[PDB]
Amino acid sequence: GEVEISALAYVKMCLHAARYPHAAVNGLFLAPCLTDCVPLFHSHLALSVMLEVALNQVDVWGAQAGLVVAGYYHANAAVNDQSPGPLALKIAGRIAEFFPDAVLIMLDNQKLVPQPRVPPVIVLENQGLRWVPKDKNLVMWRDWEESRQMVGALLEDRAHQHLVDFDCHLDDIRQDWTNQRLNTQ
Amino acid sequence: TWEEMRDKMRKWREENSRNSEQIVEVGEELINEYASKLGDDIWIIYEQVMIAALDYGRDDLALFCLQELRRQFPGSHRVKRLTGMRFEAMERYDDAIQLYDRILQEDPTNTAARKRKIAIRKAQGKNVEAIRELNEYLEQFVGDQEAWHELAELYINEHDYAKAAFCLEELMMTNPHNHLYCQQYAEVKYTQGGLENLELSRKYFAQALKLNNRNMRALFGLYMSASHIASNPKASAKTKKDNMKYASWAASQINRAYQFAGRSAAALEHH
């Protein structure tokens, strides 16, 4: 069915990919409507042990905030490639085990700094063990125009260098991977 | 010569600034209105402006600085570096590979150039070629530890965990007291999976932790490896009971890490 991507989720995802340009990055979307976003890793994404730890932390953090893990985003390092590799499909498929309607979002991290006219994203849905792109009419945006401009202005203010993902948190566990300085509001 | 401008360019170079906007703004003003006065600093400033122009999207200015530098220092390694940077910024990846290839023909162990070729191959989606090229290099320069680490990471990206584990064994054998290589070796063996790999992973996570008691990745890995071992039916009751002990030891160490972290973070927010 339809999925509404919130401003906060889209911005933090873009800020993640922009803090680590030219790297693959991934993350999770949460929903009670994709309302929030947990940036995951920017290196060695295909190793499973810290991903396992991250999935559990966000699950119980979500469960206490009345949220469920509802999606996964992934930006490929290859610049012409917006198609999900086996890692993206594996993780997204596992997430759909606990949430059948989960979405897999491929992010074009090449179309970020000049924010394009149309969202630089492909949204895929689970269709019996295969992931297939959603009809574009089924993907809705809470003020797409406003989400465009805030990413531009916040990147201009180097705000992405204050963005914390789980990799950063592992380096120093005092760092907040919920990014509670969501001063974008 | 406006001293305010020439000295600002000095401290920006010395402090490795990232303010490409201001560096282009002052530097371009210096090239066009005060070149007669810059004296000895002219060529560094030309190079400084070119780099910042590339990142700020002033390719007209970058090309001018590049052409002038090429004229003053023909054949130089540093102009080649700038030429390669420009090709990369324009996504002229093939031209970039050609440039980095003849640097490495003059210096097979050049680390910067090899590192640039690897980034380009990832941008190109040619990780497989990158793996073949790193292998050819390591057959002739087996002592290059950083190149072994680059290859390890390439194999992980390609999900070839046994080959990555092999590369990390070279790094552990040459750096037996480096906690990071033990920790990454353990993550790779954990990902390969199975009880035997999981027992191995627990042990190297324990070695990384003993090598550096503050490696959070090692602590979590020890907990996660030990907990899976303790729930695996194949394991002995001796191995299971021993790993249940490892896991709630790890769990309480994890429990304590977050409290010390959380108390430290509140002394930080209270200035």
DSSP A118-142: S-SEEEEEEETTEEEEPPGGGEEES
Which of B44, B33, B34, B83 is CA-nearest to residue B62? Answer: B83
- Residues in B closer than 8 angstroms to A50, CB to CB, are 187, 217, 220-221
Longest dimension (CA), chain B: 83
Decide if B44 is inside a domain: yes
In single-letter form, the type of residue at position B205 comes to F
The interface residues of chain A toward chain B in range 78-97, judged by CB-CB distance below 8 A, are 78-81, 86-87
Tokens 């994203």 -> residue:
A121
Tokens 């194949």 -> residue:
B234
Decide if A179 is inside a domain: no
Decide if A185 is inside a domain: no
Decide if B58 is inside a domain: yes
Q: What is the number of helices (H) and of strands (E) in chain A?
A: 5, 8
Question: How was this entry determined?
Answer: X-ray
Decide if B37 is inside a domain: yes
CA of A1 vs chain B CAs: smallest distance (Å): 33
Pick B265's closest partner by Cβ from A47, A78, A174: A174
Please, which residues have CB within 8 angstroms of residue A180's CB and are 6 or more apart in sequence? none
Instruction: Answer whether B269 touches A (CB < 8 Å).
Output: no
Tokens 């390591």 -> residue:
B138
Cβ density class A92-122: b for 16+ within 10 Å, e for less: bbebbeeeeebbbbbbbbbebeebeeebbbb
Decide if B14 is inside a domain: yes
Domain count, chain B: 1
Which of A40, A42, A103, A41 is CA-nearest to residue A68? Answer: A103
Decide if A176 is inside a domain: no
Pick B224's closest partner by Cβ from A49, A78, A87: A49
Cβ-defined contact of A80 to B257 (cutoff 8 Å):
no
* A169 to chain B: closest CA residue: B216
Using an 8 Å Cβ cutoff, are A103 and A124 in contact?
Answer: yes
Mutate which of A25, A45, A49, A74 to disrupt the B interface (most B C-beta within 10 Å)? A49
Q: What is the number of helices (H) and of strands (E) in chain B?
A: 15, 0
* B91 to chain A: closest CA residue: A79
Report the CATH number at residue A44: 3.40.140.10
H or E, element range at A29 = strand A25-31
Cβ-defined contact of A47 to B187 (cutoff 8 Å):
yes
**Phi and psi angles of residue B94, each rounded to the nearest 5 degrees, phi first:** -60, -45
CA distance A27 to A39: 4
H or E, element range at B116 = helix B111-123
Decide if B186 is inside a domain: no
* A57 to chain B: closest CA residue: B220
Please, which residues have CB within 8 angstroms of residue B77's CB and are 6 or more apart in sequence? B103
Domain count, chain A: 1
| Cα→Cα distances A14→A25, A33, A37, A116, A178, Å | 10, 18, 11, 12, 15
Decide if B270 is inside a domain: no
Mutate which of B128, B187, B223 to disrupt the A interface (most A C-beta within 10 Å)? B187
Which of A118, A113, A119 is CA-nearest to residue A73? Answer: A119
Structural domain span for residue B74? 1-90
H or E, element range at B11 = helix B3-15
The interface residues of chain A toward chain B in range 39-58, judged by CB-CB distance below 8 A, are 43-50, 52-53
- DSSP state string for B206-264: HHHHHH-TT-HHHHHHHHHHHHHHHT-TTS-HHHHHHHHHHHHHHHHHHHHHHHHHHHH
CB atoms within 10 A of CB A65: 12
Structural domain span for residue A31? 3-171
Using an 8 Å Cβ cutoff, are B179 and B213 in contact?
Answer: no
Decide if A108 is inside a domain: yes
